[model samples]
Target chain A: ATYNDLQVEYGKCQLQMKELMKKFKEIQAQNFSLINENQSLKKNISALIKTARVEINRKDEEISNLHLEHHHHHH
Target chain B: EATYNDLQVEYGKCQLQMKELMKKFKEIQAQNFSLINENQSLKKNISALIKTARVEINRKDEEISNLHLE
Candidate 1:
């Protein structure tokens, strides 16, 4: 092939490389976003579980208190 | 001519690498999407559980108030 043809081919390859790099960057950004989001959800779930435990305990206390009041009334 | 031949070879190699990179990127992207979806479902489940807890708490509060009135 002529020098010009080879130059054209080289340019095409460079363009392909650039395009591939662009897509790679875009996917990388998506991966980063997903990672952050996943982490946040985990934290949220942890907090919620903690809150649930506290709430359940408080509710149990109230129920026992009610039972005690009823017993006192009967006496 | 030799220089041109070398460049053509380099170009071919890059083209292959680019193809591989593209394939890998797509695989990763799809996996990420699935994980995101799964995470969202788990969050929804937690919210549902929280709601149920709040409802129970409200019921207990009302019951206590009734007991006091009696």
Candidate 2:
């Protein structure tokens, strides 16, 4: 091929690479955002689970006390 | 016209660059798909956990009421 032909092809290749890079950058940004949100969500969920467990324990304690009181009444 | 040698050399370089870029684009898309799926799965997991938390809360509330009645 002529130098002119090669130059034309080179330009096309460069453009393709530019477009590819742009898309890559866009997706990379989205990926990072998702990772950050996932981390935040995990922290929140962990806290929620802890709170639920505490609530369950408190309820158990109240039930146990009621059971003891009922036995006392029977005795 | 002047020299076919120069054009020949240049053509090879362009083809090589195109090939490399094509390879890169493919990799990017593959990674993108996985990231999208992972994010989706995480969201699903978060919702499931929330449902479990709500269910547990409701169950305890019922138990607490029963105890009160007894």
Candidate 3:
């Protein structure tokens, strides 16, 4: 290739590298967003489970009290 | 031109750097694919857990109401 040919090829490579770098940065941002989303979802799920356990325990205690009252009434 | 030799050398180096960048791009692309899949799985899990928690809560609510009526 002549001097002009080599210069054109070099410029094309530079453009290509620039485009690739842009895309790589975009992908990294998406990965970061997804990771943060996953962490948030996991945290929400943990909170929900904890709330459910508390509700379950409260209901069980109430039901036990009702059962005891029924037994007392039958005696 | 005498500078043709120098330009040719720079062109070769530029091509090599581009190739390396392309390789790194592909690697990160693959990693992004996995992260996408993992996000999908986590969303599905969150959805299922919400449903289960609602069902359990509703069931307990019904039990408590029935006992109160009794």
The candidate scoring highest on DockQ is 3
Model-by-model lDDT, in order? 0.80, 0.77, 0.85
Q: Highest TM-score among the candidates is held by which one?
A: 3
**Candidate 2 docking band:** medium
Tens digit of lDDT per residue, candidate 2, span A1-75?
356776677677778778877987887787788778778877877887799889878877877888888889889
Residues B1-70, model 2: lDDT tens digits: 4466766676677678778877877777787788778777777877898898788778877877887786
Error of model 3, residue B23, in angstroms: 2.6
User: Candidate 2 regions off by >4 Å?
Assistant: A1-3, B1-4
Off by over 4 Å in 3: A1-3
Candidate order by TM-score, highest to lowest? 3, 2, 1
Better of 1 and 3 by TM-score: 3
TM match of model 2 to true structure: 0.79
TM-score per candidate, chains pooled: 0.78, 0.79, 0.82
Q: lDDT at A56 for candidate 3?
A: 81
Q: Give the CA lDDT, 0 to 100, for residue A7 in model 1.
A: 74
- Order the numbered candidates by lDDT, best leading: 3, 1, 2
Give the docking tier of candidate 3. Answer: medium
Q: What CAPRI class is candidate 1?
A: medium
Which 10-residue window in model 3 chain A sums to the lowest lDDT?
Answer: A1-10
lDDT per residue (tens digit) for residues B3-69 in model 1: 8778778778877887888798788879778877977887787789778877977887787778777
**Candidate 1 local Cα displacement, residue A56, angstroms:** 2.0
